[PDB]
């Protein structure tokens, strides 16, 4: 269940569609702060996988996710305001052939040994449906879920590792999809049948671009006087 909090250096995503090469770009956006308190959930968090009780964690203006697993038990996500049919909730389910996303005014229906069942028994006052290639297809399968100006921006990064839960090196998440849901998304919960949740904050970062259109490093300008100096000078060397 809940465990160690203050140690993540990862969660940087491409803030926009503009291509940059061999430049250090200083930008302000919502990012997971470095060494922020990221909660580690210890399969299924509170409940054992058999047991029902799940976290129902809040959504504090954007959430960073990770799931270093082979079983893909946590393929789905539920986002919403009340999660009780009084308001619309966004349901994202990966069925291992595609990802199916729909948003509707659906109540919690006690959705999920080693026995699968169906979910989402009613579709009331739905707004739209979307289908695309699987979000999740060992593999870190890290995600960033941001909600701003109507759009629900989903970013992801895939990479295998065996000897560690996380690679020690730097990675950057690319946008996967940007959907115009238009709902508050005050909180969220996950669907089950290694789980990490962090939260984004407004921050300024100095991002290092490669010769190609990729980010290889970053400095969190508010973490340390050295990082602040690096951001002031627009350099990774002081």
């Amino acid at each position: 269940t809940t465990q160690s909090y203050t140690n993540f250096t990862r969660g940087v995503y491409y803030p926009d569609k503009v291509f940059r090469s061999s430049v250090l770009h200083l930008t302000q956006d919502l990012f997971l702060p470095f060494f922020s308190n990221v909660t580690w959930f210890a399969i299924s968090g509170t409940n054992g996988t058999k047991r029902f009780d799940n976290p129902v964690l809040p959504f504090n203006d954007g959430v960073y996710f990770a799931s270093t697993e082979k079983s893909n038990i946590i393929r789905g996500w539920i986002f919403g305001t009340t999660l009780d049919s009084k308001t619309q909730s966004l349901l994202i389910v990966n069925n291992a052939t595609n990802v199916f996303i729909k948003v509707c005014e659906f109540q919690f229906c006690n959705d999920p040994m080693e026995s699968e069942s169906g979910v989402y028994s009613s579709a009331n006052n739905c707004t739209f449906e979307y289908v695309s290639q699987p979000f999740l297809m060992k593999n870190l399968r890290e995600f960033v879920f941001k909600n701003i100006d109507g759009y629900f921006k989903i970013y992801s990064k895939h990479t295998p590792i065996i000897g560690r839960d996380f690679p020690q090196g730097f990675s950057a998440l690319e946008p996967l999809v940007d959907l115009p849901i238009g709902i508050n998304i005050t909180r969220f919960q996950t669907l089950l049948a290694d789980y990490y949740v962090g939260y984004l904050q407004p921050r300024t970062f100095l991002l290092k671009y490669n010769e190609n259109g990729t980010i290889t490093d970053a400095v969190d300008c508010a973490l340390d006087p050295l990082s602040e100096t690096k951001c002031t000078l627009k350099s990774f060397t002081v």
């Binding site: 491409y14 569609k17 503009v18 291509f19 940059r20 090469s21 430049v23 100006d149 109507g150 759009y151 690319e174 946008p175 115009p180 238009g182 190609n212 259109g213 990729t214």
Partner: protein, 291 residues
């Protein structure tokens, strides 16, 4: 006098204009949004999204004359030459006397309790008298007002739930009503559509109607790539863009590359040649020859 003077600058002018717009031929359903026999209530306005279509705005002039047709961040006449990132149509019916309240910077009970516009607003406010549709001798049901609100709304927020406000007396949550054909024009309903246009330097498919032309490389040309307008020389790029990125910029955030909307190739933009012009003069009292 004898010497060298810099007198003017030179430029190489473009010879043709290049229009490269998306392949989409689907027409945006602006007619269906404006042309209807049933409209959403004011407290529960209808936000319908327009995407993946051609934003032809001439149909609005064929549809009707208008009470008001005013855009704040764009000129109406030129709407057919822009591409928009996010276009939303917010449809509701309000009284003529409060049409002026649906604008950035306004204060009033309808602007504050139901439909608040942002102050940094780009978009269009469209109003057209609906008396011939809504007038009834027995009285309509089109007016739905939230007279009292516990806390004022922020831009584009909506609050469906109804509660009775207590002074400590009872203020009922909904004032709903109709009107007759004999009411004055200032009291007649007007259908109002707010077109919210988010424009972020040509990032998206929805564009007004344009006749696309061929892509010409290695010449000084004018170009318009999904609304991104400029002058320069287009060349084939060797930059490795991800499928994600559409544009490139240099060390000083000046655009230097684009993705072609139809071929998805990466093109570099080199500015057209320019520079100073200096005149070498031997001196008027010696010779009128110059270099």
């Amino acid at each position: 006098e004898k010497g060298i003077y810099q007198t003017s600058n030179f430029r190489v002018q473009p010879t043709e204009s290049i229009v490269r717009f998306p392949n989409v031929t689907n027409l945006c359903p602006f007619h269906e949004v404006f042309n209807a026999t049933r409209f959403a209530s004011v407290y529960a306005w209808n936000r319908t999204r327009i995407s993946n279509c051609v934003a032809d705005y001439s149909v609005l002039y064929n549809f009707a004359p208008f009470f008001a047709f005013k855009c704040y961040g764009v000129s109406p006449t030129k709407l057919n030459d822009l591409c928009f990132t996010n276009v939303y149509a917010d449809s509701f019916v309000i009284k003529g006397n409060e049409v002026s309240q649906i604008a950035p910077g306004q204060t009033g009970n309808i602007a504050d309790y139901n439909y608040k516009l942002p102050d940094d607003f780009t978009g269009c406010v469209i109003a057209w008298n609906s008396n011939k549709l809504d007038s009834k001798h027995s009285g309509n049901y089109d007016y739905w007002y939230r007279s009292f609100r516990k806390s004022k709304l922020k831009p584009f927020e909506r609050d469906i739930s109804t509660e009775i406000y207590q002074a400590g007396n009872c203020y009922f949550p909904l004032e709903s009503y109709g009107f007759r054909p004999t009411y004055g024009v200032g009291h007649q309903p007007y259908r109002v559509v707010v077109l919210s246009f988010e424009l972020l330097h040509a990032p998206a498919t929805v564009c007004g109607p344009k006749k696309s032309t061929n892509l010409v490389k290695n010449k000084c040309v004018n170009f318009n790539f999904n609304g991104l307008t400029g002058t320069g020389v287009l060349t084939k790029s060797n930059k490795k863009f991800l499928p994600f990125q559409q544009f490139g910029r240099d060390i000083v955030d000046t655009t230097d590359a684009v993705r072609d909307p139809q071929t998805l190739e990466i093109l570099d933009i080199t500015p057209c040649s320019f520079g100073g012009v200096s005149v070498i003069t031997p001196g008027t009292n010696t010779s009128n020859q110059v270099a």
